[PDB]
Design a protein around this ligand. Structure first.
Ligand SMILES: COc1cccc(Nc2ncc(-c3ccc(C(=O)NCC(=O)Nc4ccccc4)cc3)c(OCC3CCNCC3)n2)c1
Length: 311
C-alpha cells in the first residue's frame, strides 16, 4: 500500500541510511539514480507540521551546493522525498579517511560550504545544524549541503554557545559559529571542543578556548578567531566571509554564492525530451513544468537536466 505509487516511477535499491530511512533508487524514465527519504506520518506525530516546513524551504532552495529535491509523494502513511543521490558520501567520512585536509584542500571545500550557507541566508533561512554529516559529495566530487535532522528554519559539538543555553539567537550567527567548527575539523581532523561528558563539553563551548595545532598557518588561526567568538555580535558577518583574505588566497575572487540552477529559465532540450512522454503539446508542457508542483513531471524535468549536465 505505502510503496505502490512510488514503484510506478522508481526501481528501489538498498537502504543507504537511517535516522527517516533513505533508500537508493533509480528513476525509471531517465535511468538517473536518486536517494529517497522515507518518513512515517504516525511515527512523526506532533513533529509532522515541521516536515511540511522543511519541504517548503527545500522547494525554495535550488543551488549548485544544495542537495536537489525532485519529487514529494504523500500516501496514507508515508511522506517520500526524492532527492539528489551523492555517491561520494559524507564529508564526515572523507575527513576521517584523509586524517585531516591541507589548508589548500580545506579552502577548496570551505568555499563550497560558504557558497551554500550564504545562499541559504540570502533566501531568508538559517540551517542551524551545520556539521560534516550534513555535507555530501556528488558524482563530480563537489559538496552538497543537506539537513537530515529537520533543523533549518525560515550536534552539540557544532552548536553555538547561545543555541545551547536556550537564549534567543540569530540563525545566521549560529551558522557562522558552526562553520568555524567545520573549518577547524577540516584542518585538524578533530573537534576544537570535545569531551566524553556532555556537561564538561558544554563548559568548554561556553568558555571558547581551544588548542591551536602547530600546522595551522597564521591566516587560518585569524579566520578561526573571527568565526569562533562566544559573543555572537563579535562573529564575522557572512558578507565579510565571502571576500575574507583567507578565503581569497589562491583564488582572488569572492565566493560565488548566487544560484546557477534556475526556476525561471527552462532548458529547451529537456522540455523537448520530456514532451515525447506526454500526449500534450509543447506549450502545455512548459506551463506545467513552470508550476513546480514537485510531482513526477518536476522529477523528470530536473533529472533530464542532471543527465544533460553529465554530457
Ligand atoms: C556511497 O555511500 C554513501 C554514504 C553516505 C551518503 C550517500 N549518499 C546520499 N545521497 C543523498 C542522501 C540524502 C540527501 C538529502 C537528504 C535530506 O534529508 N534532505 C533535506 C535537505 O537537504 N534539506 C535542506 C538542505 C539545505 C538547507 C535547508 C534544508 C537525505 C538523504 C543520503 O542520505 C544518507 C544520510 C545518512 C545519514 N547521514 C546523512 C546522509 N545519502 C552515499
Amino acid at each position: 500500500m505505502d510503496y505502490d505509487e512510488l514503484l510506478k516511477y522508481y526501481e528501489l535499491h538498498e537502504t543507504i541510511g537511517t535516522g527517516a530511512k533513505v533508500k537508493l533508487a533509480c528513476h525509471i524514465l531517465t535511468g538517473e539514480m536518486v536517494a529517497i527519504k522515507i518518513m512515517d506520518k504516525n511515527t512523526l506525530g506532533s513533529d509532522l507540521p515541521r516536515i511540511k516546513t522543511e519541504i517548503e524551504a527545500l522547494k525554495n532552495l535550488r543551488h549548485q551546493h544544495i542537495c536537489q529535491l525532485y519529487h514529494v509523494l504523500e500516501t496514507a502513511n508515508k511522506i517520500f522525498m526524492v532527492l539528489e543521490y551523492c555517491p561520494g558520501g559524507e564529508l564526515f567520512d572523507y575527513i576521517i579517511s584523509q586524517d585531516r585536509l591541507s589548508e589548500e584542500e580545506t579552502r577548496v571545500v570551505f568555499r563550497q560550504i560558504v557558497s551554500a550557507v550564504a545562499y541559504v541566508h540570502s533566501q531568508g533561512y538559517a540551517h542551524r545544524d551545520l556539521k560534516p554529516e550534513n555535507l555530501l559529495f556528488d558524482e563530480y566530487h563537489k559538496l552538497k549541503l543537506i539537513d537530515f535532522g529537520l533543523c533549518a528554519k525560515p550536534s552539540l559539538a557544532y552548536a553555538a554557545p547561545e543555541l545551547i543555553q536556550g537564549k534567543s539567537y540569530l540563525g545566521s550567527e549560529a551558522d557562522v559559529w558552526s562553520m568555524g567548527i567545520l573549518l577547524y575539523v577540516l584542518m585538524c581532523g578533530f573537534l576544537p571542543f570535545d569531551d566524553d561528558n556532555v556537561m564538561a563539553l558544554y563548559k568548554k563551548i561556553m568558555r571558547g578556548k581551544y588548542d591551536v595545532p602547530k600546522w595551522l598557518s597564521p591566516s587560518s588561526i585569524l579566520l578561526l578567531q573571527q568565526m569562533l567568538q562566544v559573543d555572537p555580535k563579535k562573529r564575522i558577518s557572512m558578507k565579510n566571509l565571502l571576500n575574507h583574505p583567507w578565503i581569497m588566497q589562491d583564488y582572488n575572487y569572492p565566493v560565488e554564492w548566487q544560484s546557477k540552477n534556475p526556476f525561471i529559465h527552462l532548458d529547451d532540450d529537456c522540455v523537448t525530451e520530456l514532451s515525447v512522454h506526454h500526449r500534450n503539446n509543447r506549450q502545455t508542457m512548459e506551463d506545467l513544468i513552470s508550476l513546480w508542483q514537485y510531482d513526477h513531471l518536476t522529477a523528470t524535468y530536473l533529472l533530464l537536466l542532471a543527465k544533460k549536465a553529465r554530457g
